[PDB]
């Protein structure tokens, strides 16, 4: 369960090349991906 | 156009030239000398016991017991070969120790070592000079400098040997070019390539007059000193110590570890800002196997010996001021080179007509001298592949292992046989 979660996140870090980015650099990417997903989930509900 | 029948005939008609041209056995070379044993103070060349004035180990150190003992102990620990190109498991703890030691000897920030003495300067020049740059080079530069300047496809301006009135003329001609296209002048880099103790002439460069030109016309200096390192100065650092010039004014110094260190390889020293760029852009450093560790352990011990007592540079200096003074007065031969140089020349006065006649005359004196226990050589060049081809000459090389008696004995013998071949 928890160990399986750590492996999927590890794969996510390897595919996007965030594995070799610094801790503050990863936060920028994560922020502007979560906000874009959240702002799409809203429009795909208020316009459908 | 051009049908299938024609082509077959075109291909059958063609005949190439041979891979290597014919008619050898007219060259002066192709008759290598054979040396039996090590080329030490007393050697055997062509089966004759003689004193050698032709090897380049000015300080001894080729057959020093301490150097040999230090090389054996590193042979018993690592083996012979570094099986890799310095970037894939080719770096030993001895390499890092030798570079760190060279930097402290020369009092610079960093050093980098190459595994071959000829490649160190042939790789360094094209790492900084590119197609749109201007390089000012002394006309008497050595072959490795010429190959490095050919690999970097930049613009090469030659100036006369050792006069700054001609270099300043070229530099001021560059100002006029600069003034009529200022935007292109801000992206072109300028280099001056000189040498301390030129190999081909035996003279020394005027450095104080050149550092002042550097700051006036904004050009960087590349100093190639493989004949003055371990020779000139009170502590053997080279030509900067001879003139008392701050080493921060130079931007690059290159030497080889094969003349006074009696080893293999070369090195460059300087500031980290310039040195760190060669580790990712020097061809011979990136794509070649690193230096075998027993050769680096032999250079570290040589550095130890050089540091422990610097009175050896005083015996070498006054040893070579005697044979330079003894060879003055030979009829037909003129001496070329400074008094402070351990590797001056000996050139033919009033030439004949051709170069082949002169080489035949000089080889007669060399072969005649080898018969009386004095081993010498004449300088060797690739005649067709030289920017400027020096005159034929004989090399006289001084080392600290030569006694005063045999130093004067050599000078008398050369006079005797040069006045009976040139008469």
């Amino acid at each position: 369960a928890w160990k399986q979660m750590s492996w999927f996140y590890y794969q996510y870090l390897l595919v996007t090349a965030l594995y070799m980015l610094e801790p503050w650099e990863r936060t920028v990417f994560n922020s502007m991906l979560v906000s874009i997903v959240g702002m799409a989930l809203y429009t795909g509900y208020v316009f459908m | 156009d051009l049908t299938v029948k024609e082509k077959e005939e075109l291909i059958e008609e063609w005949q190439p030239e041979p891979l290597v041209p014919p008619v050898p056995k007219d060259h002066p070379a192709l008759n290598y000398n054979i040396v039996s044993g090590p080329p030490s103070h007393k050697t055997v060349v062509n089966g004759k016991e003689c004193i050698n004035f032709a090897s380049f180990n000015f300080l001894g150190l080729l057959d020093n017991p301490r150097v040999k003992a230090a090389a054996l102990a590193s042979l018993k620990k690592y083996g012979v070969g570094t099986c890799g190109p310095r970037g894939f498991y080719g770096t030993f703890d001895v390499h890092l120790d030798l570079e760190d030691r060279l930097a402290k000897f020369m009092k610079t920030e960093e050093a980098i070592i190459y595994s071959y003495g000829f490649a160190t300067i042939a790789s360094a020049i094209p790492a900084y000079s590119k197609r749109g740059d201007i390089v000012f080079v002394d006309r008497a530069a050595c072959f490795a400098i010429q190959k490095g300047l050919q690999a970097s496809r930049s613009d090469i301006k030659l100036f006369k040997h050792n006069d700054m009135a001609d270099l300043e003329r070229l530099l001021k001609e560059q100002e006029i070019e600069d003034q009529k296209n200022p935007r292109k002048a801000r992206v072109t880099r300028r280099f001056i390539v000189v040498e301390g103790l030129y190999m081909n002439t035996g003279t020394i460069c005027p450095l104080p007059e050149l550092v002042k030109l550097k700051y006036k016309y904004k050009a960087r200096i590349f100093l190639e000193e493989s004949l003055s390192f371990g020779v000139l100065g009170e502590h053997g650092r080279g030509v900067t110590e001879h003139y008392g010039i701050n080493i921060d004014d130079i931007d690059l110094i290159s030497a080889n570890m094969e003349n006074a260190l009696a080893s293999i390889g070369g090195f460059c020293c300087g500031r980290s800002f310039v040195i760190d760029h060669q580790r990712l852009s020097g061809q011979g450093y990136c794509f070649s196997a690193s230096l075998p560790p027993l050769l680096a352990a032999a250079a570290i011990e040589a550095l130890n010996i050089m540091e422990e007592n610097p009175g050896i540079f005083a015996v070498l200096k006054e040893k070579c001021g005697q044979i330079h003074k003894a060879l003055q007065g030979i009829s037909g031969l003129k001496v070329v080179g400074e008094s402070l140089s351990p590797a001056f020349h000996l050139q033919l006065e009033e030439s004949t007509g051709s170069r082949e006649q002169d080489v035949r005359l000089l080889q007669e004196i060399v072969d005649q001298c080898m018969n009386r226990s004095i081993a010498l050589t004449q300088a060797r060049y690739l005649e067709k592949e030289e920017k400027c081809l020096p005159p034929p000459s004989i090399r006289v090389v001084v080392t600290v292992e030569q006694t005063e008696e045999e130093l004067e004995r050599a000078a008398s013998t050369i006079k005797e046989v040069a006045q009976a071949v040139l008469l």
Binding site: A17 | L30, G37, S40, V67
Partner: protein
């Protein structure tokens, strides 16, 4: 015997390679990583202007601020934005004799690889699969070492002159006579560096009015020699005979570019084994094609000599061909013999011309005596002039190890390049972050490897390289295979479709 082509090439045993194509999804997913890295590199370069100081990089002197800047800034964008992030994979120092097991010096970094420092600890026995040590001659015991020390005691470490003045000793004459009998040629010459053997000898054979035809994957020294010769250079596709024949045919019927005159001569440059790619040259076809169009062949066997052949005599013996059909043969002594240097072999009139006209023989220092003796002693073991049978065992063990390792990797699902007999084994890594993760993960398990990225190769063709040696036992290879299998599940490197 076995099968022949239409050119004239004659094969005596099957010749089969494999270069599987990268899957489309994986190919798409690597451009994402390279794009993200480019975008963050631009942001960091922007922040370096009036923000976080990064007072760790070197800067110009104060007195030279009004000069033109020394470096073009956009060059080494990759150096400071991709390479610096994973550079703890490359210049690892060692403190032991390199073979089958090696000692690594531990180093750690606290500013993301902008500087290193040593912890004082040493990783004892790491499985070495990153050094060129075929035949296992790199060691510090045996007869080779004994002979080298004996020579070192009497001669010294250095020579202080050139072959043409006083630097030609009797050891050089003894070595050059032995290399010629080893290769089966008329005469040979030795140099002192392998990079120099090409870059200082090729310009002595061709010049203006000559054509060089170079393979697509030649080493940097061959390219530098071709650039310094002054000839014209045209590149053909790797091991493509249909491409080389077309190029060679178009060269003769149209002549030189502008004047349209006939060429003075044509020279083909190839290699016996391409190390990064793992492939072997199609020598029978190249020889059959060189004969018909009257060209000259230059063969570079840095990785083939000793490693290939039923007795160790290189790629020419591997195909069963005659060494007298190759105009110039060269190689190095660094990969299979435990020493340093290079050689050239051929006809006696080629060697006489090289002995008077090559840049090395005139201006460079000659080989060290202790290094020469180790070559002599190791070559006499392979030939069999030692009274022992240690030369046949290493040659057989290398082939056995290559077959076993290569075959076991291919059936776990990895993508492997090359020919089935090649002792260099490339394992395909595609995504840029897996280049840096694979090297760290493998060292965490006591295995040392080499990894190469985008600028060195093509964009979607990163990889790791394994070098097999005759000194690797069966249990060492079992351990390495066992750990590779684990890491390939951890990082998902089993890309093969046609398994």
């Amino acid at each position: 015997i076995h099968h022949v082509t239409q050119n004239g090439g004659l094969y005596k045993r099957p010749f089969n390679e494999a270069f599987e194509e990268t899957p489309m999804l994986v190919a798409v997913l690597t451009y994402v990583g390279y794009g993200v890295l480019t975008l963050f590199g631009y942001l960091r370069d922007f922040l370096r202007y009036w923000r976080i100081e990064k007072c760790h990089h070197a800067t110009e002197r104060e007195e030279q601020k009004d000069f033109v800047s020394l470096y073009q800034d956009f060059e080494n964008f990759y150096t400071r934005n991709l390479y610096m992030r994973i550079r703890d994979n490359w210049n690892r120092p060692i403190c032991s004799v390199p073979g089958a097991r090696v000692d690594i010096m531990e180093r750690q970094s606290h500013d993301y690889n902008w500087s290193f420092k040593y912890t004082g600890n040493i990783i004892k026995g790491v499985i070495n699969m990153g050094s060129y040590n075929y035949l296992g001659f790199a060691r510090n015991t045996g007869s080779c070492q004994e002979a080298a020390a004996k020579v070192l005691e009497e001669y010294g470490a250095g020579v202080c002159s050139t072959r043409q003045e006083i630097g030609n000793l009797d050891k050089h004459e003894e070595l050059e006579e032995l290399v010629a009998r080893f290769l089966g040629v008329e005469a040979a010459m030795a140099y002192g560096m392998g990079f120099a053997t090409n870059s200082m000898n090729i310009p002595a054979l061709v010049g203006k009015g000559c054509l060089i035809l170079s393979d697509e994957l030649n080493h940097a020294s061959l390219v530098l020699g071709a650039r310094l010769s002054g000839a014209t250079i045209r590149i053909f596709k790797h091991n493509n005979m249909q491409s080389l024949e077309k190029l060679l045919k178009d060269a003769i019927v149209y002549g030189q570019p502008r004047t349209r005159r006939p060429w003075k001569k044509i020279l083909i440059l190839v290699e016996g084994i391409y190390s990064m790619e793992g492939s072997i040259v199609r020598l029978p076809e190249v020889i059959a094609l060189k004969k018909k169009y009257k060209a000259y062949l230059y063969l570079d066997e840095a990785h083939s000599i000793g490693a290939l052949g039923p007795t160790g005599r290189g790629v020419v013996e591997y195909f069963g061909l005659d060494p007298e059909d190759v105009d110039v043969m060269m190689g190095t002594f660094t990969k299979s013999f435990g020493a340093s240097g290079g050689y050239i072999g051929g006809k006696k009139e080629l060697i006489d011309y090289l002995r008077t006209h090559s840049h090395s023989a005139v201006y460079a220092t000659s080989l060290s005596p202790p290094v020469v003796e180790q070559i002599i002693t190791s070559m006499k073991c392979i030939m069999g002039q030692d009274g022992t049978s240690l030369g046949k065992e290493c040659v057989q063990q290398l082939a056995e190890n290559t077959r076993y390792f290569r075959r076991r990797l291919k059936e776990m699902g990895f993508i492997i390049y090359g020919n089935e007999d090649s002792p260099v084994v490339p394992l395909m890594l595609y995504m840029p972050a897996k280049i840096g993760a694979f090297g760290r993960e493998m060292l965490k398990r006591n295995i040392g490897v080499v990894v190469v990225g985008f600028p060195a190769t093509p964009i979607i063709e990163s990889r790791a390289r394994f070098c097999l040696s005759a000194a690797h036992t069966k249990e060492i290879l079992d351990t390495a295979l066992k750990e590779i299998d684990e890491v390939g599940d951890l990082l998902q490197l089993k890309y093969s479709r046609h398994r």
